[PDB]
Amino acid sequence: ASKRALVILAKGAEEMETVIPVDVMRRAGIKVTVAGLAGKDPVQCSRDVVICPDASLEDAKKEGPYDVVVLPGGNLGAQNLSESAAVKEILKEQENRKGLIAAICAGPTALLAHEIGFGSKVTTHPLAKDKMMNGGHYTYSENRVEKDGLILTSRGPGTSFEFALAIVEALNGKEVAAQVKAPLVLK
Amino acid sequence: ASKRALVILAKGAEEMETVIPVDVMRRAGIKVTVAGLAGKDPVQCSRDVVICPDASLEDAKKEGPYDVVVLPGGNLGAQNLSESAAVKEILKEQENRKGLIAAICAGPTALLAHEIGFGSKVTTHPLAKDKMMNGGHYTYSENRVEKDGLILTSRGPGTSFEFALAIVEALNGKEVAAQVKAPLVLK
């Protein structure tokens, strides 16, 4: 059976950090569901790109569980994820089931908001470090991609391919990640 | 006055090659218009991401001229661009006005279809080389980004940031490109 991924899309999300992981994961044969936080209507991203979700988070949540829950970045998008009771429940359930949780850029601050993965080594966009480290609940890293067990984090738009391929390697293996990587023409 | 960019979005376009340039150009202060080839309705991209265009190409075309016309890749998207009479007219007009034309991945093959920029040094995705070189109307390059005057080309999803920043440099200068690049956390 194919692995499944849930990508939570909120208003203000960084569109590059949303599309690169969705695209790369689908190239890897992963069944991806783009779920809208506010509902089934189109979502206006940080740089005004408008994306139509596959379904609402309300409906997508009932189709779980997922092998990975992905949280894109974007300051306003991350704030919306941080204030959502629905997201809190989804992340706590995933953590409890020992499922992978991946967040990029400002996205990791939503983990702090919902008290997820305390004690893990994590990275974020440089400008989101102070927010993420408030209280010293995580140990900071400057690696482009950081993986401490089931908590996988990354730094920004420019680390999106590395972030996506790390998710692919975690779910489908190193060989598949290498096969998907070659045709992308990465450095 | 701010520079303006027209991004032509057709069914089957590579979503990463569409969103990265749109996002990066907007970060650079460029006024970007995402125009749908088939109309104003949502567009289903190559890996099923659905993007809602800012307007139809029919309407956006009446709001010219643009400082750059951008053609995303994706085999099916490029084919749709190649068969469009509207695209042919837009590209010929831009070439005549000595305006920049940028194409990535399979996107450059649309230039061949509409007999645009013959004699230029170009690059494409490795798998699109034979199609692009049919007839020997261009000279091939393996550079990640190739710029021969007003014809700017690139190779694939993994060269999208470099491609976008090359467009920014051409329109707004090296300083602005460097300022926009830093926060992206590129390797």
CB distance A12 to A151 below 8 Å: no
Please give the backbone phi and psi of residue B122, each rounded to the nearest 5 degrees, phi first. -140, 165
Distance CA B28, CA B151 (A): 20
Q: In the PDB record, what is the listed experimental method?
A: X-ray
Q: Is the CB of A47 less than 8 angstroms away from the CB of B27?
A: yes
Burial of B88 per CB tally in 10 Å (0-12, 13-18, 19+):
middle
Q: Which of residues 83-102 of A touch B (CB under 8 A)?
A: none
- Of the residues B14, B17, B22, B23, the best mutation for testing chain A's interface (the one with the most A CB atoms within 10 Å of its CB) is B23
Q: Which of residues 18-77 of B touch A (CB under 8 A)?
A: 19-20, 22-23, 26-27, 34, 42, 46-52
Instruction: List the resolution, Å.
Output: 1.5
Q: Token match 């460029």: residue? A: B30
Distance CA B30, CA B4 (A): 6
| DSSP state letters, A26-73 | HHTT-EEEEEESS-SS-EE-TTS-EEE-SEEHHHHHTT---SEEEE--
Q: Is the CB of B155 less than 8 angstroms away from the CB of A185?
A: yes
Q: Token match 């400082």: residue? A: B67
Helix runs in B13-159, H state only? 15-27, 57-60, 75-83, 85-96, 109-113, 129-132
How many residues appear in chain A?
Answer: 187
Q: Is A45 an annotated catalytic residue? A: no
CB distance A95 to A101 below 8 Å: yes
Beta bridge mates, A69:
A6, A101
Q: Select from A78, A144, A184 the least CA-distant residue to B186.
A: A144
- Of the residues B15, B27, B41, the best mutation for testing chain A's interface (the one with the most A CB atoms within 10 Å of its CB) is B15
* Dihedral sign for Cα atoms in the order A93, A95, A99, A101: positive
Residues of A in contact with B127 (CB under 8 A): 183
Burial of B76 per CB tally in 10 Å (0-12, 13-18, 19+):
middle
Q: Spell out the residues 6+ positions from residue A118 whose beta carbon is closer than 8 angstroms to its own.
A: A137, A138
Peptide bond into A21 cis (omega under 30): no
Q: Is A52 an annotated catalytic residue? A: no
Distance CA B108, CA B22 (A): 18
Superfamily for domain range A1-187: Class I glutamine amidotransferase (GATase) domain (3.40.50.880)
CB distance B71 to B110 below 8 Å: yes
Beta bridge mates, B154:
B104, B145
Q: Select from B105, B106, B102 the least CA-distant residue to B120.
A: B102
Facing B16 at nearest CB: one of A14, A19, A47 = A19
Helix runs in chain B, H state only? 15-27, 57-60, 75-83, 85-96, 109-113, 129-132, 160-172, 174-181
